[PDB]
Amino acid sequence: FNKLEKIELGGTKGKTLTESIAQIFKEFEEAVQAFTSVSYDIMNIAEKKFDDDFYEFRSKIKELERRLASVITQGFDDYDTIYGRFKLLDNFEGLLTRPIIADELEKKHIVLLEMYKQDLKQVQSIFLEGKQFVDSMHENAPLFLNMPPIAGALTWCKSLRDRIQEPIEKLAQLGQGITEREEYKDVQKLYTSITKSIKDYEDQKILSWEKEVEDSSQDKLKQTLLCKDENDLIKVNFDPSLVRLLKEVKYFLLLRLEVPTTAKDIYTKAETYRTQIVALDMIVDNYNHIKTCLLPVEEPLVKKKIQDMEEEVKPGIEEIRWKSTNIDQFISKSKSIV
């Protein structure tokens, strides 16, 4: 009873439930004051007066327990969520009054199991509609904001998987062989089937992604920098896929599991690649402005200054190979001439 006074559930309707709980705690104190006064008594084996008081006290505890069952049942219905109902059970975990409260708990356990069935079905139904969009990379897809599409599917699968397994740890906590209940077993079978489907989809993504990573490695090796149009407007030709593969690897580390094989060297220089691209981008913008923004009279007047730069950068474009980068020196000579 002392533990019951300390409890502060603060769930759904508030104060009126607490006032009823406060009266019940006071009710127990009032019984103690009757029994607490203990005129004569003192647990005498010869005196049978104490036994009569015990029977009267026994009725008072049952009245206290009956009120607790009613308030506890009302609170469970009010939360309307498996997580919310479970939290209330933890608060009253040591407050169960043996068989009186225990009988009410069995009825509560089947209702909680039924709620998890709806969540499992809702997740599964949401998963099937979501899965088709993710594979085709359609707009308004399940993946949150902007992320690598192949990397995102694994992260999205993990979020769905985490929601499904949060209740199972809490469910294993329940006593009185709720596991034996056939309804509980049926829900577990549904949960196992949903998890197996998600892994296969993840395996296809990771499996297909693994093959894509091998193809991507070649793109970094043989992209280089390519100039396009009649005007020599040199621009970075770094495959846009490389950007997704590098950003793809970072998300995998966040979701743990197994990292890609041979994608480490790329991830090792990932910080260096970003710095080099920003430096390379600045000279390219500077080198194109002089090339096409120069006045018609200006180029003819001093053709040698512009031509020397073109001859100077002509070897640089040929030099390009992400395999070995000496852009810092390349950058110093190119930026100074540009």
Partner: protein
């Protein structure tokens, strides 16, 4: 429409920034401009803001009238003037700028000159000075999680700053789902004083929006994945978890006028209003703004003319349409004893959580 902002003086102008959050789904050389709408004429934007790259988030600044600051997809930070629009007066250095697309952009009101704090996907958080962009942000912080000897950098998708909270406390939501609070100190450059939901509050999906009710600074609600949660200032675990929702909740914001009711917009195109004054258990009402998913929701503050605080709410769809909904007078107007009732219930819930 990735981000929507309201004019500080009154709800007469809305600034909306358009960008594609999908990775590589943006067409090459796609238009990258921001349009500020006028309530009087909705046929076309009153002014057009031009930026080098698409701006993920743009918000108005109360300190300087008609000044808009936004974060580009490239990570560049740009500032525009509402009266003249056109090109951006202030642009941050590209290389010194934080890598990846800007996640959140907010203005710090506790300064003589407006300052902007930017949190984004590189797991870093930076404070910038509008008057002096100079060589990158003044303060650079990486969001390490779990401290100890294990350090992993996780991108921050949400930044929450409030006047009641003050400049001292900054609320940040990581990609993993945990929430980290960084306290600026004169003595030491940055301190991650509190880690939220490290063990039991971790969200299934990355936290997208973190907000705190204007009426009570201590209580702030973070909308992550299927269901948004509400946490107290000193409790690691969330005080209240509300149901579950179809698809995901892109953004949820507290009503400025009434602390009890907060609005969450789902990615199914349905917006549901949660009111704790009457029934904690169920949604007060659910409305379908559009078939297209709702990327973000912004609620007006203060007000002028015929519009009171919280009367107009702006929600940005994935399609790119922006819809302003006039809320019912009963919902926006404070109900009798709402502030007293919400504080008693929240304190009671907080006491129950501690037990």
């Amino acid at each position: 429409v990735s981000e929507i902002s309201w004019h500080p003086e009154g709800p007469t102008k809305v600034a909306v920034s358009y960008a594609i959050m999908r990775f590589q789904q943006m067409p090459e050389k796609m238009p990258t401009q921001a349009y500020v709408w006028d309530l009087l004429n909705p046929n076309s934007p009153e002014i057009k803001l031009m930026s080098p790259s698409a701006v993920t988030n743009i918000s108005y600044n109360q300190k300087i009238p008609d000044q808009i600051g936004g974060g580009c997809y490239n990570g560049l930070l740009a500032v525009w003037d509402g009266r003249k629009g056109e090109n951006p007066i202030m642009i941050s250095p590209v290389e010194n700028s934080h890598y990846e697309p800007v996640t959140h952009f907010h203005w710090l009101m506790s300064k003589t000159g407006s300052e902007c704090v930017t949190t984004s996907t590189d797991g870093k958080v930076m404070w910038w000075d509008t008057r002096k962009f100079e060589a990158g942000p003044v303060e650079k912080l990486n969001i390490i999680e779990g401290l100890g000897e294990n350090e992993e950098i996780i991108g921050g998708t949400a930044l929450e700053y409030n006047v009641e909270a003050g400049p001292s406390k900054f609320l940040i939501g990581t990609e993993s789902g945990s929430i980290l609070t960084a306290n600026k100190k004169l003595k030491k450059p940055v301190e991650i004083t509190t880690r939220y939901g490290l063990d039991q509050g971790r969200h299934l999906g990355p936290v997208y929006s973190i907000n705190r009710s204007n009426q009570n600074p201590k209580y702030f609600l973070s909308v992550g994945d299927w269901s948004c949660k509400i946490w107290v200032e000193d409790l690691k675990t969330p005080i209240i978890r509300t149901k579950y929702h179809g698809s995901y909740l892109s953004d949820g914001c507290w009503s400025p006028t009434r602390s009890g009711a907060f609005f969450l917009v789902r990615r199914d195109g349905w917006m549901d209003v949660w009111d704790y004054y009457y029934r904690q258990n169920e949604i007060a009402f659910s409305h379908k703004v559009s078939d297209s998913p709702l990327t973000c929701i912004k609620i007006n503050q203060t007000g002028g003319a015929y519009h009171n605080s919280g009367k107009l709410c702006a929600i940005g769809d994935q399609d790119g349409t922006v819809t302003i909904l006039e809320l019912c007078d009963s919902l926006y107007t404070m109900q009798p004893k709402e502030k007293d009732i919400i504080n008693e219930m929240f304190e009671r819930e907080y006491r129950k959580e501690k037990n």
